[PDB]
């Protein structure tokens, strides 16, 4: 029949139907109870007066299981409402997830929906597939983690990956500190999310624009909630998501994802860094900030060879790239010939 | 990990070959094309050469034309990777791009290549993610059973006691009559929230008032109030209707041959009737609206034989033309289907 292809990271959850330009459901990955004994997503949060939450994803690994089921059932029977068992089901993890993690993923699959087949991709080939490349390296950066991930003719690498704890919630919180250290006292950490998402901004070079704003104006963007309040805001702007090339903000010694790029570069093979250099294609929700293609150009450029052709790849739906790479990957003619059937669970790229 | 039918004739003897994506496959090209590519779409081309000492050479080429949708790209992509797995690794891999070439590539063809206007559309289906399109009238009346059923969008429908939901998507506005009752007012916000939370998965909001509070958007939907009839009649035969509203029908192959059976003229059905062996249909046409029930474990046959004999009432009953079949896995209901049921427990 119809194959699922669900995706599901630490603060998002985007599921839809393989074949589709784009996942049908994008909801929170929370789990609310009681201080009806479960709440999902979206109407867990709109009643998290009377929950407690919590995320069973933690930095891109599964870590609360039946709270997962939790997710995947709200999924399956609420967001795209469908019997499970009748439609196969591609799921994403993370780069170097345990191989107990996608165990028990599997078995949840197949012993509490009973679905007919499935298969477990990792969410960064996914993303350069859907950038039509088979060697890059990917910079995933969404709510929870952020991965190096060079990948050579379909395969990741493993032992150049990095994995580094800052994303985009860490991004939120900061900006809610700064708002709030400003004189704005940020059920407001959503407006303060939207903020990020629609104000904030890469500069080119930090402390130059820092000047900027502080010899004029003209940096200074508002935000306009429909209570009448208008937030205004200036350099925070762009310190907020300078926290990615500088984790020092944030009180974390790890380094920026410009580093991290070129150390996982250089973690590989001499023979195709040629090839990692000119396909470092992004993927993730906290890789949309404006400019950060061109500052990663600036930057890693700065610390490769003097010669190197470099590229970096921003995709204008990178938000939904592991998702789309997914809806490619399970639509395949040749897919069929590898999933994993329920079957072939019953005898045991 | 892969034998995919063209794979199989894939690099045996020393060739050019060229498959073109279409619509997630790879279909070989004819080879009096060769050197011919759509810019719309993507190919994967394989080269193998007689190495001197026995084995074969193995060069993939991906090639991307400038006006290719991204399933196309990313399935060359794909494609590319398994072809090359199929050989067990041994083959290197090259992204080309519509007027980039490597020399390599374009020395596979003696005279040239030609580029042609067009190619096979895209396979993906166009979606916009939590994107709801609504707008619908709910009808709400009832005492000792109340119960929703849809009307025209218009002030036509109105009436001084009975309730409304003017469901418009991701806002969905209540609407109480000043002579309505109590009953209908609670069934009616049990709906509204059923509607929101569930249908919607929590992604919209509900907004409660009564005759003379009308909301903006009410009005852009409706134009102006006009004056108001005071409904048809009393609840009692109100109650008498809504009890005879739907039928509730199992379907199951369960002794051998299917048996299409009726459970229930009447209402609350109990939700102990829907079983998960089965499936059910629970039959509303007349509103325009028939849900088959699928029982997690009903087979494949009970499952296709309920749909078929649901599709079946609209060409026989009558039925509007524009009425459709709402299909539900057990576990996943919605209110509309939900209130037939005495005190609903999940
Ligand atoms: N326009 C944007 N600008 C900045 N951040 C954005 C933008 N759009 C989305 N985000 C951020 O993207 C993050 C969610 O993206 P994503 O769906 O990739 O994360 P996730 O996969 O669910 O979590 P993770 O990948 O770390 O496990 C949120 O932190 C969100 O605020
Ligand atoms: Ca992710
Ligand atoms: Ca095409
Ligand atoms: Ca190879
Ligand atoms: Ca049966």
Redesign the interface.
């Known amino acids: 029949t119809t194959a699922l292809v669900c995706d599901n990271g630490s603060g998002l959850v985007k599921a839809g139907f393989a074949g589709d330009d784009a996942p049908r459901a994008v909801f929170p990955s929370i789990v609310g109870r009681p201080r009806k004994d479960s709440y999902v997503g979206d109407e867990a949060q709109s009643k998290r007066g009377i929950l407690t939450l919590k995320y069973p994803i933690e930095h891109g690994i599964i870590t609360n299981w039946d709270d997962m089921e939790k997710i995947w059932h709200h999924t399956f029977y609420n967001e795209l409402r469908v019997a499970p068992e009748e439609h196969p089901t591609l799921l994403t993890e993370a780069p170097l997830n345990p191989k107990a993690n996608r165990e028990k993923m599997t078995q949840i699959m197949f012993e509490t929906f009973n679905v007919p087949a499935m298969y477990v991709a990792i969410q960064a080939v996914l993303s350069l597939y859907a950038s039509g490349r088979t060697t890059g390296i990917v910079l995933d950066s969404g709510d929870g983690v952020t991965h190096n991930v060079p990948i050579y003719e379909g395969y990741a690498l493993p032992h150049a990956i990095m994995r580094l704890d800052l994303a985009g919630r860490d991004l939120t919180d900061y900006l809610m500190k700064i708002l709030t250290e400003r004189g704005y006292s940020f059920a407001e950490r959503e407006i303060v999310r939207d903020i990020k998402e629609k104000l904030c901004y890469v500069a080119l070079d930090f402390e130059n624009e820092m000047a900027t704003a502080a010899s004029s104006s003209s940096l200074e963007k508002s935000y306009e909630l429909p209570d009448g309040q208008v937030i205004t805001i200036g350099n925070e702007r762009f310190r907020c998501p300078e926290t990615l090339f500088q984790p020092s903000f944030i009180g974390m010694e790890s380094a920026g994802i410009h580093e991290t790029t070129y150390n996982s570069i250089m973690k590989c093979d001499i023979d195709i860094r040629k090839d990692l250099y000119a396909n470092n294609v992004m993927s993730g929700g906290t890789t949309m900030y404006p400019g950060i293609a061109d500052r990663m150009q600036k930057e890693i450029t700065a610390l490769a060879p003097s010669t190197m052709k470099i590229k970096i790849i921003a995709p204008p739906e990178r938000k939904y790239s592991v998702w789309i790479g997914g809806s490619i990957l399970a639509s395949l003619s040749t897919f069929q010939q590898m999933w994993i059937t329920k079957q072939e669970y019953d005898e045991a790229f | 990990?892969?034998?995919?039918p063209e794979?199989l004739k894939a690099g045996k003897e020393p060739g050019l070959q060229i498959w073109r994506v279409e619509k997630?496959?790879?279909v070989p090209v004819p080879p009096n094309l060769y050197g011919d590519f759509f810019t719309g779409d993507?190919y994967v081309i394989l080269k193998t050469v007689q190495l001197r000492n026995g084995i074969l050479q193995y060069d993939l080429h991906?090639w991307?034309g400038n006006e290719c949708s991204?399933?196309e790209?990313?399935?060359?992509?794909?494609?590319?990777?398994?072809l090359?797995?199929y050989l067990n690794?041994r083959a290197?891999?090259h992204?080309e791009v519509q007027g980039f070439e490597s020399a390599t590539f374009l020395g596979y063809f003696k005279s040239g290549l030609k580029y042609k206007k067009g190619g096979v559309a895209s396979?993906?289906?166009?979606?916009?993610?939590?994107e709801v399109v609504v707008q619908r009238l709910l009808q709400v009346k009832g005492r000792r059973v109340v119960r929703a059923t849809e009307v025209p969008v218009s002030w036509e429908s109105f009436n001084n006691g009975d309730c409304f939901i003017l469901d418009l998507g991701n806002n969905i506005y209540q609407w109480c009559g000043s002579k309505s009752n109590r009953f209908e007012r609670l069934k009616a916000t049990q709906v509204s929230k059923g509607i929101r939370?569930?249908e919607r998965?929590?992604?919209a909001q509900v907004s409660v008032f009564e005759e003379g509070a009308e909301p903006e958007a009410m009005l852009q939907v409706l134009g102006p109030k006009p004056t108001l009839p005071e409904a048809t009649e009393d609840t009692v035969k109100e109650d008498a209707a809504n009890r005879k509203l739907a039928k509730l029908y199992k379907v199951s192959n369960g002794a051998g041959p299917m048996v299409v059976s009726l459970v229930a003229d009447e209402n609350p059905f109990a939700q102990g009737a829907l079983r998960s062996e089965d499936c059910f249909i629970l039959d509303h046409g007349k509103d325009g609206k028939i849900f088959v029930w699928?029982g997690?474990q009903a087979n494949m046959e009970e499952?296709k034989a309920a749909l078929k004999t649901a599709s079946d009432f609209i060409s026989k009953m009558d039925y509007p033309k524009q009425t459709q079949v709402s299909v539900?896995?057990?576990?996943?209901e919605?209110p509309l289907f939900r209130q037939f049921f005495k005190n609903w427990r999940?």
Not at chain 2, 73 to 82: C, H, K, L, P
Not at chain 2, 328 to 332: A, D, F, S, V, W
């Open positions: 990990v892969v034998e995919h794979f997630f496959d790879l993507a991906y991307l991204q399933d790209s990313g399935a060359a992509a794909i494609f590319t990777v398994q090359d797995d690794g290197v891999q992204r396979g993906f289906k166009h979606v916009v993610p939590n939370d569930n998965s929590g992604r699928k997690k499952r539900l896995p057990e576990g996943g919605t999940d």
